[PDB]
From a paper:
CK2 is a serine/threonine kinase that is a key regulator of many cellular processes and is involved in cellular proliferation and anti-apoptotic mechanisms. In vivo it exists mainly as a holoenzyme composed of two catalytic (α and/or α′) and a dimer of regulatory (β) subunits, but it can also be found as the isolated subunits. Hence, CK2 has been recognised as a highly promising target for anti-cancer therapies.
Alternative substitutions around the middle ring were also investigated and compared to compound 23. With an IC50 of 7 μM, CAM4712 was the most potent compound compared to the methyl, trifluoromethyl, methoxy and trifluoromethoxy derivatives (compounds 31, 32, 33 and 34, respectively). Substitution of the chlorine atom in compound 23 (compounds 31–34) was investigated in order to improve the moderate solubility of the related CAM4712 in water. Unfortunately, compounds 31–34 resulted in loss of activity and were therefore not pursued further.
Numbering used by the authors: 3 to 329
The structure:
Amino acid sequence: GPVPSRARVYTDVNTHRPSEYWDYESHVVEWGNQDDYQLVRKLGRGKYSEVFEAINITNNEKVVVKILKPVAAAKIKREIKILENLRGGPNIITLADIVKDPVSRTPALVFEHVNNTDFKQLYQTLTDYDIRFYMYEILKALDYCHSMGIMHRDVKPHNVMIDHEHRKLRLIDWGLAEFYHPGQEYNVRVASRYFKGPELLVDYQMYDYSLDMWSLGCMLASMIFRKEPFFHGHDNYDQLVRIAKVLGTEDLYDYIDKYNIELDPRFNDILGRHSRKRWERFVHSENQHLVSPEALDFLDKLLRYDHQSRLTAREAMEHPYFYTVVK
Ligand SMILES: CCc1ccccc1-c1ccc(CNCCc2nc3ccccc3[nH]2)cc1C(F)(F)F
Ligand SMILES: CCc1ccccc1-c1ccc(CNCCc2nc3ccccc3[nH]2)cc1C(F)(F)F
Ligand SMILES: CCc1ccccc1-c1ccc(CNCCc2nc3ccccc3[nH]2)cc1C(F)(F)F
């Protein structure tokens, strides 16, 4: 069968934690008062949530209310546990309260209010410096959550809120996040299609924090090449075909051989044979101001088939791409 794998960093963080910390079922529910909140306007949605701007009437403070649909509602204890473990961490969204509607019994998570610059404004105005600055802010969040034994598993632009006026960023929607345990086989039906790592697409279950580094690379390729999404698959099989048309089929086969991964028997018919593409093929007059040899070297070090070969979040912060960022 497949060859085992473990994270190269933060391998044993969750073993130092006591037992029964893991048994969260009818444990520390602690519901707040829903009547403290008045919904003001809809901000947007998650896949299984509706998000509102609200007012806390006991103190007139602006907050964010995330109403959970049944799919997200079922995993609420894990999202609560993860949000509480990471609270106060760099660029992590702050959970402020947990409430339930007594009429529908639907639960909601209440957060610190964070400004969210409109996506159209961000897409046209972020400079080469802005991209380096915000990517460095996301790495601070990923290194922190990875150091705490947690993988986000849904890194994408929609899960990144930017208050551009105050140069502030938050990594949000920890609903798919999970605790990393060495040797554990995880569900591959995580992240969003366009941001799924090759490990997920080839059904390699023993993945780790490195999956977040792949998704971050997809996000970066989209920002510097102004091509959203960068890898635009029609389904999960085609998603791997989109990646192979850029990274090539030779390194993909070296990857599946290294881990002894068995693919669907029709693999050759959809994957074909493709050379590695030069990054310069994606460069044109409208995005050339966002591309540098450092950017491409960084992208190259994130977007690798082999999850063990990708930069960790801490190594990524050391890359020359970030030398012009004020630290
Ligand atoms: C391809 C993305 C992109 C390319 C080039 C420049 C900027 C962006 C971008 C554009 C928008 C955003 C902001 N994302 C937050 C969206 C959002 N609003 C929410 C409201 C409610 C719930 C979730 C929410 N998520 C972040 C980004 C980001 F993070 F910089 F990539
Ligand atoms: C249905 C939305 C919901 C979904 C999931 C969890 C909680 C709620 C909820 C449930 C109740 C309230 C507070 N409702 C107060 C409404 C109200 N204001 C009044 C002012 C004067 C007189 C009567 C009034 N009734 C706030 C909320 C809130 F803000 F969404 F959290
Ligand atoms: C142990 C079963 C087995 C024995 C012999 C040959 C193949 C497999 C196999 C092995 C794995 C899977 C699961 N799906 C593979 C994932 C995948 N992603 C692809 C993307 C593109 C092309 C093929 C792809 N296959 C399905 C299968 C299946 F369906 F049984 F064939």
